[PDB]
Amino acid sequence: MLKRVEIFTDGSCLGNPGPGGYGAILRYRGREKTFSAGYERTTNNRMELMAAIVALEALKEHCEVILSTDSHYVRKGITEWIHNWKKRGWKKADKKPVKNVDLWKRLDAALGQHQIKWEWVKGHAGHPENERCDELARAAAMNPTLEDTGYQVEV
């Protein structure tokens, strides 16, 4: 019987772009482990992705994962964009580069190592863990100690 883990994630910035942070909760057999970090300057989208990336990369073995997030960006990417990006060698038809390709590839890599069941949530009511992740991200954004080197501050 495969090990089953529940992952909840959220990420955001205090103004976008701006100081940011992510929050993730990993639950296994009633026990929860928290993950969070704050970055000097980044974007909501990058933090939303970083949250899922870090939680997934925390897994030491192949597991069945129920990943829950209210991120529209992650939802659309997973169910509507990644597929097309991969087939085009990560580059749209307009020849334009894919934004946050560094995190999208890192996430795709982590996802491929487990059996994932995505749960797209829309609202905090009835989703305690998700509100908790949001609170973790906001608190971390207030005291960022990391730098998002992959963030292209350029316009």
UniProtKB/Swiss-Prot annotation:
Q: Where does Mg(2+) 1 bind?
A: D10, E48, D70
InterPro entries per the UniProt record, alphabetical: RNase_H, RNaseH-like_sf, RNaseH_domain, RNaseH_sf, RNaseHI
Hydrolase found in the keyword field = yes
Which of this chain's residues are annotated to bind Mg(2+) 2? D10, D134
Give residue ranges for domain RNase H type-1: 1-142
Keywords, ordered alphabetically: Cytoplasm, Endonuclease, Hydrolase, Magnesium, Metal-binding, Nuclease
Coiled-coil intervals: none
Q: Which GO terms describe its biological process?
A: DNA replication, removal of RNA primer
Q: What is the effect of changing E48Q?
A: Loss of activity
Q: Output a single Gene Ontology CC term carried by this record.
A: cytoplasm
Alphabetized HAMAP family for the sequence:
RNase_H
NCBIfam families noted in UniProt: PRK00203.1
Q: What is this protein called?
A: Ribonuclease HI
Source species of the chain: Escherichia coli (strain K12)
